[PDB]
Structures are given as C-alpha cells and as structure tokens.
Short mmCIF file of C-alpha atoms in Angstrom, two decimals:
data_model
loop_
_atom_site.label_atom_id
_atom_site.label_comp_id
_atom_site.label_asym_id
_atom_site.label_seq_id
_atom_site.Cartn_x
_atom_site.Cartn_y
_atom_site.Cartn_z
CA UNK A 1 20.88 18.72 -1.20
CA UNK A 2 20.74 22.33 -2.30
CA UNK A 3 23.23 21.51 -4.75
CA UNK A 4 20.68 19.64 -7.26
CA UNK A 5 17.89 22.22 -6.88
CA UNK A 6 20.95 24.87 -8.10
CA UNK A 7 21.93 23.10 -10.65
CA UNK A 8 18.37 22.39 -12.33
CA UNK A 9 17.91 26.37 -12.05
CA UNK A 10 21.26 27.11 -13.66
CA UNK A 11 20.61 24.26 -16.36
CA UNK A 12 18.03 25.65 -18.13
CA UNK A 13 18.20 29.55 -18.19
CA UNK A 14 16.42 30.97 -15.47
CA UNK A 15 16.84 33.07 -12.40
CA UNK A 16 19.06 32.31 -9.60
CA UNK A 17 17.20 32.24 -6.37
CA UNK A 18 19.81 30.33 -3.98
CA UNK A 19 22.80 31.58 -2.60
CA UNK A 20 25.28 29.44 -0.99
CA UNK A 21 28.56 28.75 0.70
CA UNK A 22 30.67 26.87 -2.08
CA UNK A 23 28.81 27.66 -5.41
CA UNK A 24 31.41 25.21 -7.17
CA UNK A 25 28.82 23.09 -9.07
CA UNK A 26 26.86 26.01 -10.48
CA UNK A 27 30.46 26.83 -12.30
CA UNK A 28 31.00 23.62 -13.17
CA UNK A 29 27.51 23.41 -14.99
CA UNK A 30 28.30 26.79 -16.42
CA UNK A 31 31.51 25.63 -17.86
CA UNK A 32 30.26 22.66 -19.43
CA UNK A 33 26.89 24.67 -20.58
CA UNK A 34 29.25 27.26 -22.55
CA UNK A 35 31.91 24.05 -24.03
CA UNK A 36 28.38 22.13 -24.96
CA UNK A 37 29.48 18.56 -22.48
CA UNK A 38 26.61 18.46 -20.86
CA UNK A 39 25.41 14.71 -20.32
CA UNK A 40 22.51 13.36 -21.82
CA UNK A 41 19.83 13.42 -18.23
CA UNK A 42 21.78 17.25 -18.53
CA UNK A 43 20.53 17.72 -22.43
CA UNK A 44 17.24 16.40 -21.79
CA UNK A 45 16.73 18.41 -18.82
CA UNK A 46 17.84 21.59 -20.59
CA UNK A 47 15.80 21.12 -23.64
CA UNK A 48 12.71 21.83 -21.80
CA UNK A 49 13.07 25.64 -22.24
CA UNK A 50 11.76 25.72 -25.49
CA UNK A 51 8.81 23.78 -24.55
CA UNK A 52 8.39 26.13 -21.38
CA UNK A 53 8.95 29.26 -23.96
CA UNK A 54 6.91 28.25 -26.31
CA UNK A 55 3.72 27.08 -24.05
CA UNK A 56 4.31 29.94 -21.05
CA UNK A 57 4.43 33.42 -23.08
CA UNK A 58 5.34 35.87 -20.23
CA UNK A 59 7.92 33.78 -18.61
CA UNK A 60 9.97 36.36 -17.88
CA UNK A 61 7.90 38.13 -15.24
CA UNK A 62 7.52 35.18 -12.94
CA UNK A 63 9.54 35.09 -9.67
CA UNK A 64 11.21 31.73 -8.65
CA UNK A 65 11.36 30.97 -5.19
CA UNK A 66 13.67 29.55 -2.92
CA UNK A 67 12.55 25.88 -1.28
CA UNK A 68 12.07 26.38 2.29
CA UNK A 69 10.23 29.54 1.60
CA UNK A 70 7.87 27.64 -1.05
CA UNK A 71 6.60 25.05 1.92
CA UNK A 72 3.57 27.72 3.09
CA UNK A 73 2.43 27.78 -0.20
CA UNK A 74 3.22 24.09 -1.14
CA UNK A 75 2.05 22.15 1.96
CA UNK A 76 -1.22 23.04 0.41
CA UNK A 77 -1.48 22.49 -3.05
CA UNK A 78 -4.92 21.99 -4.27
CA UNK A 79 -5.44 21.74 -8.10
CA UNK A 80 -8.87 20.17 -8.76
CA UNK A 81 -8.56 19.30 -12.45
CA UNK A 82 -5.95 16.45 -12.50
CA UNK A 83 -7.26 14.87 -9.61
CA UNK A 84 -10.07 12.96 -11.20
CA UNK A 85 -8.63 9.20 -11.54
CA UNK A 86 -8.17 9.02 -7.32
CA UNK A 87 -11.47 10.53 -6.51
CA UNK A 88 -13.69 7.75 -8.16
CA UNK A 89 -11.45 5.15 -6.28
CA UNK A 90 -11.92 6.78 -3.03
CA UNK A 91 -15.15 7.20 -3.69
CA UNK A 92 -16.22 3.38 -4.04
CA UNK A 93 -13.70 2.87 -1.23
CA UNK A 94 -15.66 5.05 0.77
CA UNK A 95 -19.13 3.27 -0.29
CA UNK A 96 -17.75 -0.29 0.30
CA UNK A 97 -16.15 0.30 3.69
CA UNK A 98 -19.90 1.74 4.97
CA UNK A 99 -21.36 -1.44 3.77
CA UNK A 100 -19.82 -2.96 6.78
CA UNK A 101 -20.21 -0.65 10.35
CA UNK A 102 -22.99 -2.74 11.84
CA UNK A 103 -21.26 -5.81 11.29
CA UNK A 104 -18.21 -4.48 12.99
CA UNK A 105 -19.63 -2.74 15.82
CA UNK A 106 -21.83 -6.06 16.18
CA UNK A 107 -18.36 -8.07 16.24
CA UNK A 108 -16.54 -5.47 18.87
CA UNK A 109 -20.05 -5.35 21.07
CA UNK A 110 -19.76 -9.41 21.29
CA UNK A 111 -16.25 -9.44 21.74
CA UNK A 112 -16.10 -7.14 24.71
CA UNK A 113 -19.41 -8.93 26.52
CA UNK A 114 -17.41 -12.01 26.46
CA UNK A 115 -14.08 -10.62 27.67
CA UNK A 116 -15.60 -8.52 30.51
CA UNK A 117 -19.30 -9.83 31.27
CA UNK A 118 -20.27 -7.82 33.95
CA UNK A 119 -23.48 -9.58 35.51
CA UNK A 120 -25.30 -6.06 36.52
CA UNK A 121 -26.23 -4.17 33.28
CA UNK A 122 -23.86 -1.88 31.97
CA UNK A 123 -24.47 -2.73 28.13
CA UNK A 124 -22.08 -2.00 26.01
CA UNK A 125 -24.52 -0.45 23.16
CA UNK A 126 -23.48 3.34 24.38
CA UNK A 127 -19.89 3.66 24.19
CA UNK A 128 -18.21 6.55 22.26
CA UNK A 129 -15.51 4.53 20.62
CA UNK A 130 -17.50 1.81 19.44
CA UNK A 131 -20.15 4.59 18.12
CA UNK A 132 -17.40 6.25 16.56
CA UNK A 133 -16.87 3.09 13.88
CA UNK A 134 -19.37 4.44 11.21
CA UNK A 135 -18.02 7.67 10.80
CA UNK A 136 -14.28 6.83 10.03
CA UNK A 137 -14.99 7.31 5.83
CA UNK A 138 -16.91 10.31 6.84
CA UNK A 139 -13.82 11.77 8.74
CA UNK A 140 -11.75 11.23 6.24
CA UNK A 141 -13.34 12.25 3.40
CA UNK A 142 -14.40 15.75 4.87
CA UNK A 143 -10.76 16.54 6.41
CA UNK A 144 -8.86 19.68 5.80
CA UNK A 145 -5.51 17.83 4.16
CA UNK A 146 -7.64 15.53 1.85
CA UNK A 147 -7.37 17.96 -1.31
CA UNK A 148 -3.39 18.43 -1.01
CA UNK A 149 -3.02 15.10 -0.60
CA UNK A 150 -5.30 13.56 -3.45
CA UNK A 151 -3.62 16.55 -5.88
CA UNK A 152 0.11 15.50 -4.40
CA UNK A 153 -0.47 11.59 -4.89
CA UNK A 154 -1.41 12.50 -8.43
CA UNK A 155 1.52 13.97 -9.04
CA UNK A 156 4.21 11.62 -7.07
CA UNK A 157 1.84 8.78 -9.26
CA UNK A 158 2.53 10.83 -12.42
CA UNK A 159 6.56 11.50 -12.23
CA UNK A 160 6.78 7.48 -10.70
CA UNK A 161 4.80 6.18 -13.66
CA UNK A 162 6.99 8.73 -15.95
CA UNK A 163 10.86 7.32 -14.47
CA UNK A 164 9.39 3.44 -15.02
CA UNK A 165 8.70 4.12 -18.79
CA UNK A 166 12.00 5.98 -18.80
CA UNK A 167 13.82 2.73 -17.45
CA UNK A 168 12.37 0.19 -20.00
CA UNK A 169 12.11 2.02 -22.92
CA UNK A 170 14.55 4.68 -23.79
CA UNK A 171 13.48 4.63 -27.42
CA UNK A 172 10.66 7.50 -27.07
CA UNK A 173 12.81 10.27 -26.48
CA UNK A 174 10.92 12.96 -28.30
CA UNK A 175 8.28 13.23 -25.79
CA UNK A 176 8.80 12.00 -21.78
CA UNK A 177 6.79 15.37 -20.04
CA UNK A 178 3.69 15.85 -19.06
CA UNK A 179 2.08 18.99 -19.57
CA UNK A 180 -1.11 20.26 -17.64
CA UNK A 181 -2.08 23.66 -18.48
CA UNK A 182 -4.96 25.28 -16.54
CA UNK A 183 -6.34 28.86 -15.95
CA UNK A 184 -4.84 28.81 -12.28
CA UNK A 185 -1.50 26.30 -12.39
CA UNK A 186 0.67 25.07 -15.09
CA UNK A 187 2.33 21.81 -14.58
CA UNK A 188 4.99 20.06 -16.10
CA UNK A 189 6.63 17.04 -14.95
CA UNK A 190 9.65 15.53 -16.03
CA UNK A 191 11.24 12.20 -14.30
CA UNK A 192 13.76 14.60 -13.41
CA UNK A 193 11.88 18.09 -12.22
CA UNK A 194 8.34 19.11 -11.35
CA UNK A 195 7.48 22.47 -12.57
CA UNK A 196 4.79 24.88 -10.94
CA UNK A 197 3.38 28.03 -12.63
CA UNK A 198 1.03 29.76 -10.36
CA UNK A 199 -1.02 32.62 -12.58
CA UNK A 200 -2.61 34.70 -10.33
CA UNK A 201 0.21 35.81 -8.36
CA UNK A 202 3.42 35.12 -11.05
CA UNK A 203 4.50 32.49 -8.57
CA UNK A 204 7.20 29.52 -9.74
CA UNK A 205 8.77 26.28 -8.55
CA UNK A 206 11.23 24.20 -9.54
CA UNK A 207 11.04 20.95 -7.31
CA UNK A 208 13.42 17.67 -7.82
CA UNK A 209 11.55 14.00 -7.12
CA UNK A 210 12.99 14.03 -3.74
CA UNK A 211 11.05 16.90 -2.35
CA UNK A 212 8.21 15.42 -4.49
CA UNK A 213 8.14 12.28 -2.39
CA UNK A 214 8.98 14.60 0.61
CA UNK A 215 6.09 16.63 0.42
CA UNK A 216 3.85 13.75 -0.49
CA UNK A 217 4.61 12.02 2.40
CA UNK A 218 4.58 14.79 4.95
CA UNK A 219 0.99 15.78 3.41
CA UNK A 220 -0.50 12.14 4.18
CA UNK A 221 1.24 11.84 7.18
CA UNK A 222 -0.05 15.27 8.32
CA UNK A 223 -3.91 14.45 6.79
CA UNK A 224 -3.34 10.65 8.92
CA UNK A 225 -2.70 12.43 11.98
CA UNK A 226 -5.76 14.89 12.32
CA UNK A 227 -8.03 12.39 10.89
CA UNK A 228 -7.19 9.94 13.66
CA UNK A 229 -6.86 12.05 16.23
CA UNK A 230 -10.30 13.90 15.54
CA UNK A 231 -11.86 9.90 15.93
CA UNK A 232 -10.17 9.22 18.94
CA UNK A 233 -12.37 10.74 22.21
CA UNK A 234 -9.29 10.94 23.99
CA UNK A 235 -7.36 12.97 21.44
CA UNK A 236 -9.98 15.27 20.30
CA UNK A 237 -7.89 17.91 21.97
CA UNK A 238 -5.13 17.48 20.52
CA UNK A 239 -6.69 17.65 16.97
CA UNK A 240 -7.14 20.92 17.41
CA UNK A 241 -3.87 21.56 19.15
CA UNK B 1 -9.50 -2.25 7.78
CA UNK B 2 -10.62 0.68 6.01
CA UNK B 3 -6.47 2.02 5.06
CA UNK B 4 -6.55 -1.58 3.83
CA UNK B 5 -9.52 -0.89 1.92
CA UNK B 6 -8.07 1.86 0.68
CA UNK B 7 -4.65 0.24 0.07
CA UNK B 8 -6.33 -2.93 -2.33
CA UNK B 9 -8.21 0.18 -4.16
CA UNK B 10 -5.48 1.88 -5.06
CA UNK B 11 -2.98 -0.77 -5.88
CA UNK B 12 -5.58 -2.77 -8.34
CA UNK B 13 -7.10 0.09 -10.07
CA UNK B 14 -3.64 3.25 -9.82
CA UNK B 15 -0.58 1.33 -9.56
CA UNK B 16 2.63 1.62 -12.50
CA UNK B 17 2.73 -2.07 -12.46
CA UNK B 18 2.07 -2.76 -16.15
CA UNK B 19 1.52 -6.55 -15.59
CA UNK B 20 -2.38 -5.74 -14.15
CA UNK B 21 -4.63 -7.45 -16.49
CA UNK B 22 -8.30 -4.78 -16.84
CA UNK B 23 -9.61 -8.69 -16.37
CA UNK B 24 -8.46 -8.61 -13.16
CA UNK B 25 -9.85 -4.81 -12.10
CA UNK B 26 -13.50 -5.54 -13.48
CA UNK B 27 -14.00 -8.66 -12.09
CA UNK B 28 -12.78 -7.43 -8.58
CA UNK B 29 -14.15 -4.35 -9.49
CA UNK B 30 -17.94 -5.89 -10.59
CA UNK B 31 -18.94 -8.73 -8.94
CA UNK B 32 -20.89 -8.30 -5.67
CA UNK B 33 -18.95 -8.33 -2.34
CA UNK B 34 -15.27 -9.22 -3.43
CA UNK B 35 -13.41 -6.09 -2.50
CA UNK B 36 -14.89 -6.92 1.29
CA UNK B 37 -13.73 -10.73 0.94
CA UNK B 38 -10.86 -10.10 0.23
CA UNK B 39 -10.17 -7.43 2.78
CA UNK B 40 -12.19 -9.05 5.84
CA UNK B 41 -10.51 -12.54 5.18
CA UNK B 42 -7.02 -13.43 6.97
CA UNK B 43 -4.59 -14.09 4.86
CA UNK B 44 -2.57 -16.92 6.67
CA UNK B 45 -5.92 -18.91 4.63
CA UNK B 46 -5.90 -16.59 1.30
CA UNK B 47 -6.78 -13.11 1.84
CA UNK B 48 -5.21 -9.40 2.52
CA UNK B 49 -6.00 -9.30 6.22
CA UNK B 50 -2.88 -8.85 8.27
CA UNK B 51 -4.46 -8.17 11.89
CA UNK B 52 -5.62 -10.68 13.89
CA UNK B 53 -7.78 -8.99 16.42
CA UNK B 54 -6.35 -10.74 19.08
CA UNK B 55 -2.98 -8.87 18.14
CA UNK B 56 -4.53 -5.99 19.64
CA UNK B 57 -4.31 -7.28 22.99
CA UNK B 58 -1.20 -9.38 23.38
CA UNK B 59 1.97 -9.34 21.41
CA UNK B 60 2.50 -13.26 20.98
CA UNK B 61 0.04 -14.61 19.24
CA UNK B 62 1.03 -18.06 18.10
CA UNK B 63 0.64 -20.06 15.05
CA UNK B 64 -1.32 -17.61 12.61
CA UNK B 65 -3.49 -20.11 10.98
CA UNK B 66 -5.38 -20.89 14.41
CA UNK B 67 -6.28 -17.02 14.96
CA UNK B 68 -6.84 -16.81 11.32
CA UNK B 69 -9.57 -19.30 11.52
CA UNK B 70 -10.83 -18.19 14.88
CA UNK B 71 -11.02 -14.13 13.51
CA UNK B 72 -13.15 -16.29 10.30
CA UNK B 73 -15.62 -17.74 12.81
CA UNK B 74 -15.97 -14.42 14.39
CA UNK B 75 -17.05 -12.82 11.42
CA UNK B 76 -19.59 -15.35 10.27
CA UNK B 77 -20.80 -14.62 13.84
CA UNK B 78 -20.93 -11.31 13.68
CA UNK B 79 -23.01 -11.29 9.60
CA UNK B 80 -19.53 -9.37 8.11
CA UNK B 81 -18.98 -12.88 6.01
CA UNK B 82 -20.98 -15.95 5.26
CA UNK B 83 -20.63 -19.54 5.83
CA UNK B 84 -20.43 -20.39 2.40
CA UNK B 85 -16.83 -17.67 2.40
CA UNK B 86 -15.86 -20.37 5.06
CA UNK B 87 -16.77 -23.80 2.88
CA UNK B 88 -14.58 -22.48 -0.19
CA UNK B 89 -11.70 -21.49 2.60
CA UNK B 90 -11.96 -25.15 3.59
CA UNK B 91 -11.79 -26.49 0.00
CA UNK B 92 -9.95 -24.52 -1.69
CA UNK B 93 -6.62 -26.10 -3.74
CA UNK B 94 -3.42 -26.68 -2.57
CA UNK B 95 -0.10 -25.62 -4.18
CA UNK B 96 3.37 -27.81 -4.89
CA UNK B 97 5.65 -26.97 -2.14
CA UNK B 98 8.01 -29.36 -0.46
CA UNK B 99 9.37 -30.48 2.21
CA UNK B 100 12.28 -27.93 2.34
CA UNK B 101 10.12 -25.21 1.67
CA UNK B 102 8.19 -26.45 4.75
CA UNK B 103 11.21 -26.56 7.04
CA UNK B 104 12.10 -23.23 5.75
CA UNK B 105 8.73 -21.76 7.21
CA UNK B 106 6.96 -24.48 9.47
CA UNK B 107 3.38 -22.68 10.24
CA UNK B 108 2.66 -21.84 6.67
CA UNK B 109 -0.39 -24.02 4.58
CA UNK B 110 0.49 -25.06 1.36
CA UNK B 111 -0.95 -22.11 -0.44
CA UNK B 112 -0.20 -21.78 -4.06
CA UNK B 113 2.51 -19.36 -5.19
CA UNK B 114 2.55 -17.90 -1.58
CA UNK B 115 6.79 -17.35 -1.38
CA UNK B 116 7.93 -13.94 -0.35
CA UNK B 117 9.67 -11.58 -2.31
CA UNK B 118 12.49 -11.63 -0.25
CA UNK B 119 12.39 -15.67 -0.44
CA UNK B 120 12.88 -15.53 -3.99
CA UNK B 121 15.60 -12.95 -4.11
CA UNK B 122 17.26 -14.91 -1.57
CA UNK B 123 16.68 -17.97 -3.71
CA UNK B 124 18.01 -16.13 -6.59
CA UNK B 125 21.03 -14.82 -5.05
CA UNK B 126 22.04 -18.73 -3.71
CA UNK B 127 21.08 -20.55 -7.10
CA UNK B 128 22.63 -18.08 -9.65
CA UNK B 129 24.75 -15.17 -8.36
CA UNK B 130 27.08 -16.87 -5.86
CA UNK B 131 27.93 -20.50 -7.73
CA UNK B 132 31.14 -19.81 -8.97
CA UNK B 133 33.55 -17.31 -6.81
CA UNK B 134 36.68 -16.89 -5.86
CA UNK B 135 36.12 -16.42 -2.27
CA UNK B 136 36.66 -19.51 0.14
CA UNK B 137 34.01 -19.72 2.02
CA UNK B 138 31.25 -19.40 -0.49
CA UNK B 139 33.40 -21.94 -2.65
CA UNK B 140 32.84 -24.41 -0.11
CA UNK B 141 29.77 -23.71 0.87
CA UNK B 142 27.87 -22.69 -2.71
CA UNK B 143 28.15 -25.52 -5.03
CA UNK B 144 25.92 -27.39 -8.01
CA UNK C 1 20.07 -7.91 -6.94
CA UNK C 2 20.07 -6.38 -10.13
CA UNK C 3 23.29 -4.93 -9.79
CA UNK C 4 25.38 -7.79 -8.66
CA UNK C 5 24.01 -9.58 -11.28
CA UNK C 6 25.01 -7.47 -14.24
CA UNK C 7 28.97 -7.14 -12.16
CA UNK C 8 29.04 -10.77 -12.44
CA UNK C 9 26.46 -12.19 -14.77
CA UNK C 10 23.95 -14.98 -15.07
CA UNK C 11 20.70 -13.42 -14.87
CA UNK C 12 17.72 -14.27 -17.05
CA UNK C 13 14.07 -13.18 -18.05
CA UNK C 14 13.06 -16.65 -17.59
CA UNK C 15 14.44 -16.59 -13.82
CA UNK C 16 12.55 -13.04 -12.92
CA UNK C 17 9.73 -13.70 -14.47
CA UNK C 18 7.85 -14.65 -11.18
CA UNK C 19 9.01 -11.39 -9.48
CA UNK C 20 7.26 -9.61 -11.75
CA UNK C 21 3.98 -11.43 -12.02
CA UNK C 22 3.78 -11.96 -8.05
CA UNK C 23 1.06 -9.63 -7.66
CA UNK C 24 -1.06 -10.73 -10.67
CA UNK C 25 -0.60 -14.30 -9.56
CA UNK C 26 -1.71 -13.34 -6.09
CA UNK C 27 -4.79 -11.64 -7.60
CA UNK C 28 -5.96 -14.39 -9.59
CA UNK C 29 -5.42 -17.36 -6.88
CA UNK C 30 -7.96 -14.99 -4.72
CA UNK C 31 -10.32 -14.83 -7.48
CA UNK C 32 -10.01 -18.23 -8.58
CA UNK C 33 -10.71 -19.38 -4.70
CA UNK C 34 -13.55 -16.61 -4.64
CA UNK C 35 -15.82 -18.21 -7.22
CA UNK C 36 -15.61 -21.94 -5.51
CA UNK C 37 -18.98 -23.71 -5.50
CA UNK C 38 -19.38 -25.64 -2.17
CA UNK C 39 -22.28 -27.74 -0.46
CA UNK C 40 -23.23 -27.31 3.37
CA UNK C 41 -23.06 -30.76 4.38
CA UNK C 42 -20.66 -30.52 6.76
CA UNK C 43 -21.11 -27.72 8.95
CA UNK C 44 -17.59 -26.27 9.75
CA UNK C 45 -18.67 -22.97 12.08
CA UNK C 46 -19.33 -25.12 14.75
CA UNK C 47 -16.02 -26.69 15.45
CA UNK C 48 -13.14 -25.02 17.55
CA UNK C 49 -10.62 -23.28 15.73
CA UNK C 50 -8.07 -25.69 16.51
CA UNK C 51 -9.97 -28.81 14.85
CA UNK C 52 -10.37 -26.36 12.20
CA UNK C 53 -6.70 -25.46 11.70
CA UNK C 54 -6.09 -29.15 12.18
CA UNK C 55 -8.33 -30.08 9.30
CA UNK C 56 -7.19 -27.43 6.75
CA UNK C 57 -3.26 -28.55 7.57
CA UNK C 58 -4.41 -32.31 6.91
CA UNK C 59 -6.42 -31.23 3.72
CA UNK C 60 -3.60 -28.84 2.11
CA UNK C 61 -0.33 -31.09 2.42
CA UNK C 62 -2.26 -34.24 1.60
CA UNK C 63 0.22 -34.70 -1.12
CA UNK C 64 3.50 -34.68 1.19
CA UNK C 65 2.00 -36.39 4.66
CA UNK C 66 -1.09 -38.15 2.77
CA UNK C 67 -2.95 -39.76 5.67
CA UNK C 68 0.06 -39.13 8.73
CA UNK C 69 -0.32 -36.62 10.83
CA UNK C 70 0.92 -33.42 11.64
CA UNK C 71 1.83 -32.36 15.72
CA UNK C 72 3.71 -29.82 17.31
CA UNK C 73 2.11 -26.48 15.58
CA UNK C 74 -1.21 -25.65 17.17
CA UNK C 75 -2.04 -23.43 20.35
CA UNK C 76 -5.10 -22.21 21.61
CA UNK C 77 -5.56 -18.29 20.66
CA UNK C 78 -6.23 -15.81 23.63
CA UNK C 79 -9.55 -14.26 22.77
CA UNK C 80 -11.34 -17.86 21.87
CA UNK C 81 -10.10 -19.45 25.18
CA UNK C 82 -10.16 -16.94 27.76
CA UNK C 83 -13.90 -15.76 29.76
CA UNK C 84 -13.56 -12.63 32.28
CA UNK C 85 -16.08 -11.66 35.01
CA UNK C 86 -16.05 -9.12 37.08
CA UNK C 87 -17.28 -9.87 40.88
CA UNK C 88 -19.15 -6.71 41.84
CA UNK C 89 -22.29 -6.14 44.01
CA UNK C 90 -21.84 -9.07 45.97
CA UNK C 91 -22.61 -12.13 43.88
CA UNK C 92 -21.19 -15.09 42.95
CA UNK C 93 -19.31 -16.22 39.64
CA UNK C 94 -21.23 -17.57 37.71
CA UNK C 95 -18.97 -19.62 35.90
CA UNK C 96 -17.59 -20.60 39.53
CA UNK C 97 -21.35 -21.50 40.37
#
C-alpha cells in the first residue's frame, strides 16, 4: 500500500516524494502531528529524527526516492560490512556439502546401471548431469545475486529478530534501532522502517518490512533461478536469457 | 540435499528462536560428520531428509518407513554413511505414544516427541479453547 | 490460536511450553540417537527393506503390541524391486535367460 510508505515520510519530517489520488491519510497524520495524538508505534516512529539528525549531519541535501523507482538501485544492494555472521555459515556449508560428491555420483551411477542395464557398454561414468554434481557449491557461491542476497537476509534477519524482542519485552523502550554507519551506506532499522543513506551519490530510502520481505524474497528467488538454471545442460540457455 | 544443508546451517547457528542452547550449535557444530548425518538420513527413522529418491520417479510412494530404510541401505552402499549410522537407527529408543495417537497417523514409528505443530495446535484448540460454548454443535460434540 | 484464546480464555505457559521447545527437543533426540554405541553382531545391510521396516515397527511399539504383530502397512518400494533391460543388438535377456 502506498498509503504506509506516505505516512512514514510525513511522520517524521522529511520530503514528500509520492503523489497520489486521495492524499486523505497524509492529512490525517498531519492533523494529529500538529494536536500531538499520535499513537505510541506513531511516537516511536517519529522520535527517530533526532537520532537521524544527530548521527547524519547534512541531512538536508539528500533526495528521497519514490519505491518503484528505488528497485534498479535496490535489487542490488551489496554492503560488505554487516554481512559477516552468514558468510562463515555458508562457508562450512559449502565445505561439508563437497565432502560428499563422490559418494553421490557413486549412488546415482549405481542407481541408473540397475534401472537401465544396457548389456553393450555405454557406461554411465561420462554423463554431463551426473558430472555436474560437484560443482553445485561452486555455482552458487560464485553467482552474480549471492552478495544482494547474503546483505538482504542480514537485514530481513535483523528487523525479524528486532519485532520478536519488541513482542516479549516492551520494557526497553529507550533503545529498539539498529544503527550501522559506514563510509558508503548508513543503515538504520527499526521493527517498523528500514532506512538507507547512500553517500556517494546523496541517495535515500525509506522502506516498510513488507517491501523488506519483498525484496528479500525476490533477490533469492532471482539468485535460485540462475544458479539452477546455469547447472542444468538443458537450461544453460536460458541462464543467460 | 545441499538447500537442506544450507537450511540446518542456518536455522541452528542464525535463527531468532531464543530457546537454541550454544550446547546444541557446538556439538552439531564440532563433532566429526553430524551435520551430514543428519542431512543424508530420512527422517521417517530420525533425521532431516524429506526426499526419498524414489519420489523422483513416481508420485505414490507408499509407506515412508520402507523407502526410508531402502534410501539408508543405498547410502551405506554407495560409502555416503556407515553401517554403524544403520545399527544406532535400529536401536535407537522409542517414545510414549498410544494407541490413539497411532490411529491418528497409522505409518508413523514411535519416535519420541515426533507430533506436528499443527497436531498440537489442533490438540490445543479441542482440549482447551472449545470446552465450554454456547454453540450446539460443539456443545454436544466437545465435552470433559 | 493465540487470539481466540485471549477472546475467550484458558490458555497457559504450562500448555505452550512444547510449542516452543519443539525444535530444541528435535535437536537433542538427533544428537542423543547420534552418539549410540552399537555392536555388529547382527548384520542388518543385508536384509530387504521390508524385513527391515518390519523389524524396526516390532522393536519401537514393543510397549503397545509387545510380542503381536503388526500387518497391513508394508509395500515393496519401486526402485528396490524393479530391474530394466534394454533388448538391443540382438541378444537375449539376460534375466529372461
């Protein structure tokens, strides 16, 4: 919905990017900013501008923009510094998945000689998909959506991790952001917003947990597909296509 | 096998489930050939496997346990597992079901604390949220 | 679940405790089969899987059935039973031999 991503730019004081048919909940938030009734999710979400004022010094020259716009830029996200708790994991994944190819291409060799036993040759030893079992880790760890998708699982694990601790304890409500500051990005999350500074080019977005999950998703789905398709003899093609 | 791989990784060492013991993590994590145990064996006996190879071909399998064991003798075959993985499969310990938990679910082995989630939602819902109601039907049929 | 039980009432730690240690419990049942210590006196990789599925269902509900027996359950799996040969190059099946 448009609606939310409005209304978490007109919260907190910052420019207005969208424009849109019925702007009837950006007055509503308006009228209840200036009458001070905003709810509490509304208060904590607002209070964030001081922290974002007080860390970010030349706020003011950074352009917001829009979210369908943002998806170039966004669909890959690579920020190599807060990605370092998923790499060692995939890592020893990596290592104890190749301590088992020959076993499995030994399993699929005997399993197809005793479905179809031809008596005239023909070995089985030479076959491109059965060759192709002890390079899967290799495919997937040198593919071009890896580095989105380790940085955006990082940050859907960060915001999900952040909304749990929200639900059973309440009490710590001084501090429930997280703030990663970097000489290329500037991240904050919130269990309510995910917040993207972008240095080098005064870039900014303001994304709610839906299009965090969105974007996840679409990222691993997208990585999924050209990995397995690049393995696949028959739909090397289309990898490429 | 190897999204699975991936999958028990992630889940045992960068999950928000607070109730994962760091006992747990470094002993999986540790001792020699566990991860690959537990990924390799089919779970209708204990582990995390969930494809029967023989799925790959026809749709029907039949009672789980049979493939289970067949896909166990395969590996041992093939040097992914050893015989000794297929000695403590044999005599390992039973659980405490009975014998409506059997009728509710007729090819499972009495494996210890194996109930669904759903089962024990379901279970939930019957025991405690639907006992006393206004409504007819679950009057008659819901009682103590 | 969570929600009808908080409209009506009657819900307790004590009855969602085992929702919440599922996955721990499933963990440590693994491990705790994991580090078994058995003997290879009988050799159980040379019988078919269906003696094998019979003897684990005999062995894990020995406390319901005890010595009865359990019928009805097992069927043959696909890959196990069948054997395919392709006749080419005139000669004979072997199997059919």
């Amino acid at each position: 919905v448009k609606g939310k991503i409005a209304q978490l730019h007109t919260i907190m004081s910052l420019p207005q990017p969208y424009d849109m048919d019925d702007d009837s909940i950006l007055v509503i938030t308006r009228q209840k900013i200036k009458l001070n009734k905003l709810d509490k999710r509304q208060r904590s979400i607002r209070r964030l501008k001081l922290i974002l004022t007080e860390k970010v010094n030349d706020l003011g020259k950074y352009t917001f923009i829009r979210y369908p716009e943002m998806s170039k830029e966004m669909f890959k996200l690579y920020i190599p510094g807060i990605n370092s708790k998923v790499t060692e994991l995939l890592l020893k994944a990596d290592r104890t998945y190749s301590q088992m190819t020959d076993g499995l291409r030994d399993l699929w060799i005997n399993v197809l000689s005793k479905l179809a036993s031809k008596n005239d040759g023909s070995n089985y030893d030479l076959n491109e998909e059965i060759n192709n079992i002890s390079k899967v880790h290799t495919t997937y760890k040198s593919d071009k959506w890896y580095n989105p998708f380790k940085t955006w699982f990082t940050i859907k694990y960060d915001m999900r991790r952040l909304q749990k601790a929200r639900n059973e304890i309440t009490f710590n409500v001084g501090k429930d952001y997280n703030l990663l500051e970097d000489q290329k990005n500037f991240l904050l999350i919130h269990p309510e917003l995910v917040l993207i500074l972008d240095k080098q080019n005064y870039n900014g977005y303001l994304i709610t947990p839906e299009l965090v999950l969105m974007y996840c998703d679409v990222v691993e789905g997208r990585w999924n597909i050209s990995a397995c398709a690049k393995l696949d003899p028959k739909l090397q093609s289309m990898y490429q296509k | 096998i190897f999204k699975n791989i991936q999958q028990l990784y992630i889940a045992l060492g960068m999950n928000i489930n607070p109730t994962i013991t760091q006992n747990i993590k470094d002993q999986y994590f540790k001792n020699s050939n566990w991860m690959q145990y537990a990924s390799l064996i089919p779970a209708s006996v204990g582990g995390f496997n969930y494809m029967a190879m023989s799925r790959c071909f026809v749709r029907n399998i039949g009672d789980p346990s049979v493939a289970a064991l067949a896909d166990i003798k395969r590996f041992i075959k093939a040097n992914l597992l050893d015989r000794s993985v297929l000695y403590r499969i044999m005599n390992q310990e039973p659980g405490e079901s009975s014998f409506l938990d059997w009728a509710s679910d007729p090819y499972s082995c009495n494996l210890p604390q194996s109930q669904n989630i759903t089962t024990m939602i379901k279970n939930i819902t019957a025991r405690n949220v639907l006992q006393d109601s206004p409504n007819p039907l679950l009057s008659g049929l819901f009682t103590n | 679940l969570i929600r009808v039980g908080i409209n009506r009432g009657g819900l307790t730690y004590s009855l969602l405790r085992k929702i919440s240690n599922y996955d721990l419990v499933q963990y440590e049942t693994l491990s705790r089969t994991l580090r078994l210590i058995v003997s290879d006196k009988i050799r159980y990789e040379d019988m078919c899987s269906v003696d094998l599925a019979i003897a684990l269902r005999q062995k894990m509900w020995i406390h319901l059935s005890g010595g009865r027996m359990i019928s009805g359950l097992e069927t043959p799996d696909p890959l196990e039973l069948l054997s395919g040969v392709v006749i080419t190059g005139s000669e004979h099946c072997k199997i059919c031999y």
